Amino acid sequence: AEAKRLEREQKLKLYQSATQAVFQKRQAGELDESVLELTSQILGANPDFATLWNCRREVLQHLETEKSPEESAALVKAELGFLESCLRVNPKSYGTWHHRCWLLSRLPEPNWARELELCARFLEADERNFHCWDYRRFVAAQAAVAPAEELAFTDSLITRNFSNYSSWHYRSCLLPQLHPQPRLPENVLLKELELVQNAFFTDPNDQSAWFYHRWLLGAGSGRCELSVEKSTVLQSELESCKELQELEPENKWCLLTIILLMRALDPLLYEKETLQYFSTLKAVDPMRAAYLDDLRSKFLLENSVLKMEYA
Amino acid sequence: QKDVTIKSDAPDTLLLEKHADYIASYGSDYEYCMSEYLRMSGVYWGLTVMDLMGQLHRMNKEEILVFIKSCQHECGGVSASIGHDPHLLYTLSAVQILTLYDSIHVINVDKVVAYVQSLQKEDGSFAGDIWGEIDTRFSFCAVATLALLGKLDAINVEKAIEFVLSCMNFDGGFGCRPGSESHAGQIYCCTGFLAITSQLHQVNSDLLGWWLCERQLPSGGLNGRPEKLPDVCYSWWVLASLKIIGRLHWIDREKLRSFILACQDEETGGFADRPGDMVDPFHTLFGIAGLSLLGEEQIKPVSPVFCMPEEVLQRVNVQPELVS
Numbered sequence: 001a002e003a004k005r006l007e008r009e010q011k012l013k014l015y016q017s018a019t020q021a022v023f024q025k026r027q028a029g030e031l032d033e034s035v036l037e038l039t040s041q042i043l044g045a046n047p048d049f050a051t052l053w054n055c056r057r058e059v060l061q062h063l064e065t066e067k068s069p070e071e072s073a074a075l076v077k078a079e080l081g082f083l084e085s086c087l088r089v090n091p092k093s094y095g096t097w098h099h100r101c102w103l104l105s106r107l108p109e110p111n112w113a114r115e116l117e118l119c120a121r122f123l124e125a126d127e128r129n130f131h132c133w134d135y136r137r138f139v140a141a142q143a144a145v146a147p148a149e150e151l152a153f154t155d156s157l158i159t160r161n162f163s164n165y166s167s168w169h170y171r172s173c174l175l176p177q178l179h180p181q182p183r184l185p186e187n188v189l190l191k192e193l194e195l196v197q198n199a200f201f202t203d204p205n206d207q208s209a210w211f212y213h214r215w216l217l218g219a220g221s222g223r224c225e226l227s228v229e230k231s232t233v234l235q236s237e238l239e240s241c242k243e244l245q246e247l248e249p250e251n252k253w254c255l256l257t258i259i260l261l262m263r264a265l266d267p268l269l270y271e272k273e274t275l276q277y278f279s280t281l282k283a284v285d286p287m288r289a290a291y292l293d294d295l296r297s298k299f300l301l302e303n304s305v306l307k308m309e310y311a
Numbered sequence: 312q313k314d315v316t317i318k319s320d321a322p323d324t325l326l327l328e329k330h331a332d333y334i335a336s337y338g339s340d341y342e343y344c345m346s347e348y349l350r351m352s353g354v355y356w357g358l359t360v361m362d363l364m365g366q367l368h369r370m371n372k373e374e375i376l377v378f379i380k381s382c383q384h385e386c387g388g389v390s391a392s393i394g395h396d397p398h399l400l401y402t403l404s405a406v407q408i409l410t411l412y413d414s415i416h417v418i419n420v421d422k423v424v425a426y427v428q429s430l431q432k433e434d435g436s437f438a439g440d441i442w443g444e445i446d447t448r449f450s451f452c453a454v455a456t457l458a459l460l461g462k463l464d465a466i467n468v469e470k471a472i473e474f475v476l477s478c479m480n481f482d483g484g485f486g487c488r489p490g491s492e493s494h495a496g497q498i499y500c501c502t503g504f505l506a507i508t509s510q511l512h513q514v515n516s517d518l519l520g521w522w523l524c525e526r527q528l529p530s531g532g533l534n535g536r537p538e539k540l541p542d543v544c545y546s547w548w549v550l551a552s553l554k555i556i557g558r559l560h561w562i563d564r565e566k567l568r569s570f571i572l573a574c575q576d577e578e579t580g581g582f583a584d585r586p587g588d589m590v591d592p593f594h595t596l597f598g599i600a601g602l603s604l605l606g607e608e609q610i611k612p613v614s615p616v617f618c619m620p621e622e623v624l625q626r627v628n629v630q631p632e633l634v635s
C-alpha cells in the first residue's frame with residue numbers, strides 16, 4: 001500500500017516538472033532534442049496529451065531545416081521506434097497513430113510494405129483494433145495496394161479465429177471496389193453467401209457473420225428476379241437455418257435470418273410461417289420485442305401492398 | 312456473450328445529492344492533474360451535469376469565464392487549458408459552457424468562426440486542429456459549435472454533409488473516416504451532425520436502429536460495438552443516437568436504467584464506466600444524461616444532440632428536429 005500508492009506522487013512530480021520544462025523550453029523558442037527527451041518520458045504513459053505530440057512535430061519540423069539529409073533520416077527512424085514502443089504500451093491512442101501517419105506522410109521514400117507488416121502484427125494482437133485497421137487503409141491507399149490483395153488478407157483473417165466484425169466490415173467496402181459502379185454482381189454475391197454461411201454454421205453465436213449476411217440478403221436484384229440458382233441457394237440456407245434452430249433453439253440470429261430469408265424468397269407464400277417465427281423469436285429475445293413488432297408491422301404493410309397489387 | 316454480471320448488492324436508487332456533492336468538490340489530486348489535457352471538456356461535463364440536476368449555482372461562474380477567455384488563442388481556437396494548443400474539441404466545450412452561462416461574448420465569436428472555417432478540407436471533412444487529423448467527431452464539433460453561435464452558414468455545409476454520408480457503412484452506422492468500421496461514438500457524432508444540418512432523412516433508421524438496439528446486453532448495459540463489454544458512456548452514445556433517429560423504444564429501458572444505477576458509487580458519489588469501478592465526471596454526465604433521456608423526473612430534459620439541458624437550447628433557439 002505505502003510503497004506503490006506513494007510511488008505515484010513521485011511519478012506525478014516528474015511528469016509535473018518535465019511538463020513544466022517542456023512549456024518553458026517551448027515559450028523560449030528552444031526547438032531542440034531536449035524537448036524530444038522530455039516528451040518521450042511523458043508520452044509513453046500519457047499518449048493522449050495531444051499538446052506534447054504537437055511539440056514533437058514542431059521540434060522535428062524545425063530540426064529538418066538545420067540538419068543534413070542523413071541526420072534528418074536518423075531522427076525519422078528514431079521517431080518510428082519511439083512510436084512503436086508507445087503503441088506497444090497503448091495501441092488505442094488517437095494521438096499516437098496520427099503522429100505516425102503525419103510522420104510517414106511527409107517522408108520522401110516511405111517504406112509502406114514495412115508499415116503493412118506493423119499492421120498485420122498489431123492485428124494479430126487485437127483483430128478489432130479499429131485504429132490499426134484505419135491505419136492499414138491509410139497505408140494501403142498511400143502504397144496503392146489493389147482491393148484484391150486486401151480481399152485476400154481478410155479471408156485469411158476470417159478463418160484463423162473469431163472476432164471478425166472488423167474483417168467482414170472491410171470486405172463490405174472492398175467488394176464493391178472490385179466491381180465499381182455508380183449492389184453486387186450475382187456471381188460475387190453467391191460466393192459471399194457461401195463464405196458467410198460457412199462462418200455462421202461453424203460458429204452460430206458470433207453475430208458478425210449474421211450482420212454481414214443480412215446485408216448480402218439486400219445486396220442483390222429483388223425476389224421477382226430470383227435466378228433458379230439464387231432461389232435454390234436461399235432455399236438451402238433456409239433449411240440449414242431450420243436445422244441450426246433444432247440444435248440451438250434459443251439462438252436468436254438464426255430465427256431472425258429465417259424470417260429474412262422467407263421475405264427474400266416469397267413474402268406472401270411464407271406469411272403464416274413468418275408470423276409463427278416472430279412469436280418464437282420474441283420469446284427467445286425479449287429485449288428486442290419492440291424492434292421485432294415494428295419489423296413485423298413493416299412486413300405486414302409490405303404484404304398488404306403486394307396483395308392489393310393483385311389483378 | 313461478453314457481458315458484466317451485476318452483483319446483487321449494487322446500487323438500485325438514484326443518489327442525486329451525492330453526485331452534486333461529488334462534482335461540486337471535484338478539483339480540490341492525482342487523476343485531476345493528469346487530465347489537464349482535457350480540462351475544458353472536464354469543466355463542460357461538470358457544469359452540464361450540475362445544471363441537469365439544478366445545481367449549477369454551486370459551481371464558479373466568474374472563475375470559469377476567466378479561464379475560458381485565457382484559453383482562446385490568436386487563431387480563434389480554444390485549448391483545453393492554459394498553455395495547451397487549440398482544438399475543435401475544446402472550442403466546442405468552451406462554447407457549450409458559455410452557452411450554459413449566456414456569456415458567449417466572453418470570447419471573440421468572429422474568431423472562433425474563422426477558426427472552425429479554416430479546418431474544413433476540400434472534401435468537406437474537418438481536421439481537429441492545424442495538424443490535420445480527420446475524424447467525423449470533428450465534423451460534429453464544427454457544426455455544433457457553429458449551430459450554438461448562429462453561424463452554421465460559415466462553412467460549406469453540403470460538402471460537409473457529403474463527407475459524413477461517405478462514412479456510412481453496410482450496417483447503417485458510421486466510422487471515423489470513409490471505410491472505417493461502425494462505432495457508437497462515431498454514430499452519435501454523425502447522427503448529431505445530420506440532426507444539425509437537417510439530413511436525418513438520409514439515415515436508414517430501421518437498419519441503424521437495429522444495430523444500436525443489438526448493443527444492449529443481457530446485463531441491461533449497452534456496448535459500443537459487437538463483442539465488446541457494456542459501459543455507461545456507450546450507454547449514452549447509443550441511447551442518444553436512437554433518440555435522434557426515433558427508435559429509443561427499441562431498447563429495454565428498465566434493464567438499461569438498472570445498469571446505469573448499478574454504476575453509481577454509493578459512498579464517493581459519481582458514476583464509473585461499469586459497476587464497482589472508479590467514478591469520474593465524464594461517466595457522471597453520461598449516466599445522468601442517459602437516465603434523463605430514459606424519463607427520470609429528478610433530472611432536467613437533456614438534448615440528445617448537444618448533451619445540454621433542453622431549456623438552454625430553447626433559449627438560444629437551436630433545437631434541431633429529430634426523426635420521431
Ligand SMILES: COc1ccc(S(=O)(=O)N2Cc3cc(C#N)ccc3N(Cc3cncn3C)C[C@H]2Cc2ccc(OC(=O)NCc3ccccc3)cc2)cc1
Pocket residue numbers: 048349352400403448451452544584591592593594616617618
Ligand atoms: C481514465 O483513463 C483515460 C483514458 C482515456 C482518456 S481520453 O482522453 O482518450 N477520452 C476522455 C475520457 C475521459 C474520462 C474522464 N473523466 C474517462 C474516459 C475517457 N476515455 C476513455 C474511455 C471511455 N470509455 C472507454 N474508455 C477506454 C476516452 C475519451 C472519451 C471522450 C473524449 C472526448 C470526447 O469528446 C467528444 O467526443 N466531443 C464531441 C461532443 C461533445 C459534446 C457533446 C457531443 C459530442 C468524448 C469522449 C482519458 C482518461
Ligand SMILES: [Ca+2]
Pocket residue numbers: 367368369370371372
Ligand atoms: Ca456559484
Ligand SMILES: [Zn+2]
Pocket residue numbers: 542543544545584
Ligand atoms: Zn466509457
